Each structure stands twice: as C-alpha cells, then as structure tokens.
Design a protein around this motif. Structure first.
Motif, PDB file in Angstrom:
ATOM      1  N   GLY A 199      -8.975  -1.358 -11.688  1.00  0.00           N
ATOM      2  CA  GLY A 199      -9.848  -0.464 -10.946  1.00  0.00           C
ATOM      3  C   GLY A 199      -9.207   0.879 -10.640  1.00  0.00           C
ATOM      4  N   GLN A 200      -7.912   0.876 -10.324  1.00  0.00           N
ATOM      5  CA  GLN A 200      -7.210   2.136 -10.100  1.00  0.00           C
ATOM      6  C   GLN A 200      -7.344   3.033 -11.328  1.00  0.00           C
ATOM      7  N   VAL A 201      -7.106   2.472 -12.516  1.00  0.00           N
ATOM      8  CA  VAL A 201      -7.090   3.273 -13.738  1.00  0.00           C
ATOM      9  C   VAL A 201      -8.485   3.779 -14.078  1.00  0.00           C
ATOM     10  N   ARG A 202      -9.511   2.924 -13.938  1.00  0.00           N
ATOM     11  CA  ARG A 202     -10.889   3.370 -14.163  1.00  0.00           C
ATOM     12  C   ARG A 202     -11.262   4.490 -13.204  1.00  0.00           C
ATOM     13  N   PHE A 203     -10.917   4.335 -11.927  1.00  0.00           N
ATOM     14  CA  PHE A 203     -11.229   5.367 -10.950  1.00  0.00           C
ATOM     15  C   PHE A 203     -10.612   6.695 -11.356  1.00  0.00           C
ATOM     16  N   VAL A 204      -9.376   6.660 -11.866  1.00  0.00           N
ATOM     17  CA  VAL A 204      -8.684   7.898 -12.192  1.00  0.00           C
ATOM     18  C   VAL A 204      -9.212   8.495 -13.487  1.00  0.00           C
ATOM     19  N   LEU A 205      -9.619   7.664 -14.445  1.00  0.00           N
ATOM     20  CA  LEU A 205     -10.230   8.211 -15.653  1.00  0.00           C
ATOM     21  C   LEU A 205     -11.612   8.788 -15.348  1.00  0.00           C
ATOM     22  N   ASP A 206     -12.393   8.109 -14.495  1.00  0.00           N
ATOM     23  CA  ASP A 206     -13.717   8.612 -14.129  1.00  0.00           C
ATOM     24  C   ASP A 206     -13.621   9.942 -13.407  1.00  0.00           C
ATOM     25  N   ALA A 207     -12.561  10.146 -12.620  1.00  0.00           N
ATOM     26  CA  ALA A 207     -12.390  11.419 -11.928  1.00  0.00           C
ATOM     27  C   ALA A 207     -12.087  12.548 -12.909  1.00  0.00           C
ATOM     28  N   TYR A 259      -0.380   1.308 -20.053  1.00  0.00           N
ATOM     29  CA  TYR A 259      -0.081   1.348 -18.625  1.00  0.00           C
ATOM     30  C   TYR A 259      -0.293  -0.019 -17.975  1.00  0.00           C
ATOM     31  N   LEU A 260      -1.423  -0.670 -18.257  1.00  0.00           N
ATOM     32  CA  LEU A 260      -1.727  -1.952 -17.629  1.00  0.00           C
ATOM     33  C   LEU A 260      -0.720  -3.035 -18.019  1.00  0.00           C
ATOM     34  N   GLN A 270      -9.076   5.299  -1.270  1.00  0.00           N
ATOM     35  CA  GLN A 270      -9.883   4.705  -2.325  1.00  0.00           C
ATOM     36  C   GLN A 270      -9.023   3.944  -3.329  1.00  0.00           C
ATOM     37  N   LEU A 271      -7.786   4.386  -3.558  1.00  0.00           N
ATOM     38  CA  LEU A 271      -6.947   3.714  -4.541  1.00  0.00           C
ATOM     39  C   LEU A 271      -6.331   2.428  -3.985  1.00  0.00           C
ATOM     40  N   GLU A 272      -5.878   2.438  -2.717  1.00  0.00           N
ATOM     41  CA  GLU A 272      -5.224   1.264  -2.133  1.00  0.00           C
ATOM     42  C   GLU A 272      -6.133   0.049  -2.079  1.00  0.00           C
ATOM     43  N   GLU A 273      -7.431   0.212  -2.284  1.00  0.00           N
ATOM     44  CA  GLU A 273      -8.328  -0.919  -2.167  1.00  0.00           C
ATOM     45  C   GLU A 273      -8.692  -1.502  -3.520  1.00  0.00           C
ATOM     46  N   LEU A 274      -8.088  -0.997  -4.597  1.00  0.00           N
ATOM     47  CA  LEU A 274      -8.389  -1.404  -5.962  1.00  0.00           C
ATOM     48  C   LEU A 274      -7.160  -2.025  -6.610  1.00  0.00           C
ATOM     49  N   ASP A 275      -7.393  -2.945  -7.544  1.00  0.00           N
ATOM     50  CA  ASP A 275      -6.322  -3.449  -8.400  1.00  0.00           C
ATOM     51  C   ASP A 275      -5.945  -2.405  -9.458  1.00  0.00           C
ATOM     52  N   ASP A 276      -4.984  -2.764 -10.305  1.00  0.00           N
ATOM     53  CA  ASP A 276      -4.498  -1.847 -11.329  1.00  0.00           C
ATOM     54  C   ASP A 276      -5.628  -1.388 -12.254  1.00  0.00           C
ATOM     55  N   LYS A 308       0.820  -1.197   0.000  1.00  0.00           N
ATOM     56  CA  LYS A 308       0.000   0.000   0.000  1.00  0.00           C
ATOM     57  C   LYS A 308       0.856   1.249   0.000  1.00  0.00           C
ATOM     58  N   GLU A 309       2.000   1.213   0.673  1.00  0.00           N
ATOM     59  CA  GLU A 309       2.863   2.384   0.694  1.00  0.00           C
ATOM     60  C   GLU A 309       3.419   2.669  -0.700  1.00  0.00           C
ATOM     61  N   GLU A 310       3.725   1.617  -1.474  1.00  0.00           N
ATOM     62  CA  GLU A 310       4.211   1.821  -2.838  1.00  0.00           C
ATOM     63  C   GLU A 310       3.105   2.283  -3.780  1.00  0.00           C
ATOM     64  N   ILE A 311       1.846   1.954  -3.475  1.00  0.00           N
ATOM     65  CA  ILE A 311       0.728   2.520  -4.231  1.00  0.00           C
ATOM     66  C   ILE A 311       0.707   4.028  -4.041  1.00  0.00           C
ATOM     67  N   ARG A 312       0.766   4.464  -2.783  1.00  0.00           N
ATOM     68  CA  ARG A 312       0.804   5.883  -2.464  1.00  0.00           C
ATOM     69  C   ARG A 312       2.030   6.567  -3.064  1.00  0.00           C
ATOM     70  N   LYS A 313       3.211   5.939  -2.963  1.00  0.00           N
ATOM     71  CA  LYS A 313       4.404   6.529  -3.565  1.00  0.00           C
ATOM     72  C   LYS A 313       4.252   6.654  -5.079  1.00  0.00           C
ATOM     73  N   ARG A 314       3.653   5.648  -5.721  1.00  0.00           N
ATOM     74  CA  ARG A 314       3.540   5.654  -7.176  1.00  0.00           C
ATOM     75  C   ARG A 314       2.564   6.731  -7.648  1.00  0.00           C
TER      76      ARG A 314
END
Ligand SMILES: CNC(=O)c1c(-c2ccc(O)cc2)oc2ccc(O)c(CN3CCC4(COC4)C3)c12
Length: 267
Positions: free
Chosen positions: A153-161, A178-179, A145-151, A119-125
């Motif tokens: 889901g992370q990307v969809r969340f960020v595109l939806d934002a 990216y994936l 919200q990001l640490e609880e998603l896979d790659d 999770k810390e590397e998710i935040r760092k990335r």
C-alpha cells in the motif's frame, strides 16, 4: 506456473534435485553458473516470484515441493532473497515431517543491527528516500497516511501521487525490486534444527547500504546463529553481488558438490 526447470531429473530415479529460489528483483536464471559447478546430471528447479509475506510465500512453495519430491530428501538453495525463502521452506517442510538434508544460503546476510518495525522508522525511511529523490532528479511527506499502510500500500500510494502530479515496464520492475528488498528487511526468522551452510561474502554494495545503512555491518555468523545451532559458515570474500557469479561461485560450487556427494552416498 512459478517453477522453472533448469535441468530436468530423469523420468525415474537419478540424483536428488537442487531447488533454488529467485533473488530480489530477479529470476532463477542467475543460478545457471552455479549449476555448471555442480555434479553432472544434478537436477535443478527454480522457484520464481509469488505474492505475500515470507511465510505466506512458503505456504505456496511447500505444497509444490512435496508434489515434486515427496518425503525427500530436500536440498534448498538461494542467493539474496532466495536464501530467506529456502530457509522458510526448510522450516515448513520440517514441521510436515520431511527430510531436509541441506539448506544453502548464498550471502543471505542479515542487517548488522535489527531493523525496527516501527512508525518512526517508516518516517525515517521515507525521509531518506525523499532526500535522494531531489538529488538524482533535481515537499511535505504525508506521514500519517503512510504509517497506516503496509509496504504494498505504501508503494501504490506513492506511485499514485506521481500519477496525480513513468512507463509501465520500469514501474513493474522497481515495484517488485523494492518489495522483495523490504521482504528481506521485514523477515521474522524462526529457529531451525537442521544443518545450514552460509556462504559469506565480505560486504554489501554501497547502493544497498545507502537504502538502509544498517547493512554496513555484518556479524560473524551473518545474523543466523541465534536461530540455527548447526550453522556452518563458508567465507568466500568479495561483494554480495559477485557471490552468485564466476569465478566466486566456483568456490560455492566445490563446497556444495561435496555436500551433495555425501547425501548421494547415504542413499
Ligand atoms: C537499491 N538496493 C536495494 O537493495 C533496495 C531496493 C531496490 C529498489 C529498486 C530496485 O530497482 C532495486 C532495489 O529497495 C530497498 C528497500 C529497502 C531496503 O532495505 C533495501 C536495501 N536492501 C534490503 C536487503 C538488502 C541486503 O541484501 C539486500 C539491501 C532496498
């Protein structure tokens, strides 16, 4: 489907096919220069993009490989992400009792230090991406919200934002780019008992390094010696991105032609 015929094998008989696997953000048409450096009438089939993690992708490739090649023998080749996939199908085919006689990795070189799956590397990335984004385009990262998603889901969340605040074609290409690159980061490499040839360049580009700085270093064995006892490294020099093109691929192809000729002799 997901298989591209670069050069068809004859209706019956002929030489062993070469199976190449697509690179990250790209298609198997990039192996055409390599094909021109291989023996005449070497058949070649390209496996294109499918969904899943690395092992789940090989769960779809392996049954197709066995439809096309039966018992064997198997020659599996890949540049960039393709190398990991070819190796993953080498392990799946070996467990099924298949004859794999050549696995060719074209600069499929691991990060010099292991990338933590934390999770810390998710935040760092995501902080690293965030700072680059304000630079090349002139806020609070919702980390929980990001640490609880896979790659994916992370990307969809960020595109939806971004939508909640870009043309479809640019989005689709960068989503798969990216994936596939994260697929390389996250790959859990399993031990393999056969022979692996690793065509090793000098370095990754400064673009790759900026995305993940642990690619600034390469071990001599490219990160594979722990998992492969019969490991051969062919130094080819240059950059990752040029290992697939002329004129460096001529060096890859001269080596691979000798390996294929030996396989044809033992048939
Ligand atoms: C920009 N370069 C890239 O490699 C990367 C792209 C990316 C995004 C959008 C695009 O349109 C194209 C690429 O996302 C990434 C996500 C994670 C990551 O660690 C990297 C670094 N790669 C991982 C494996 C690697 C070593 O061999 C290749 C380098 C990337």
């Amino acid at each position: 489907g997901f298989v591209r015929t670069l050069r068809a094998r004859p209706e019956a008989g002929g030489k062993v096919p070469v199976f190449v696997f697509h690179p990250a953000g790209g298609s198997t048409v990039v192996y055409e220069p390599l094909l021109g450096r291989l023996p005449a009438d070497t058949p070649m089939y390209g496996f294109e993009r499918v969904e899943g993690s690395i092992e789940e992708r090989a769960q779809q490739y392996v049954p197709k490989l066995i439809e096309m090649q039966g018992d064997g023998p198997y020659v599996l080749v890949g540049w960039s992400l393709g190398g990991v996939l070819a190796y993953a199908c080498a392990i799946g085919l070996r467990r099924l009792g298949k004859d794999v006689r050549f696995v060719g990795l074209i600069d499929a070189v691991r990060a010099g230090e292991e990338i933590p799956q934390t999770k810390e590397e998710i935040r760092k990335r995501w902080d690293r991406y965030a700072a680059f984004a304000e630079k090349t385009f002139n806020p609070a990262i919702p980390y929980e919200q990001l640490e609880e998603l896979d790659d994916e889901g992370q990307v969809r969340f960020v595109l939806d934002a971004v939508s909640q605040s870009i043309p479809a074609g640019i989005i689709e290409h960068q989503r798969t780019s990216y994936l596939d690159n994260r697929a390389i980061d996250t790959a859990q490499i399993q031990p393999y008992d056969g022979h692996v040839t690793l065509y090793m360049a000098d370095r990754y580009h400064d673009d790759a390094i900026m995305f993940e700085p642990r690619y600034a270093v390469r071990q001599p064995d490219g990160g594979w010696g722990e998992y492969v006892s019969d490991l051969e490294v062919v130094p080819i020099g240059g950059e990752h991105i040029q290992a697939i093109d002329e004129p460096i691929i001529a060096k890859v192809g001269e080596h691979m032609s000798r390996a294929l000729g030996q396989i044809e002799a033992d048939r």
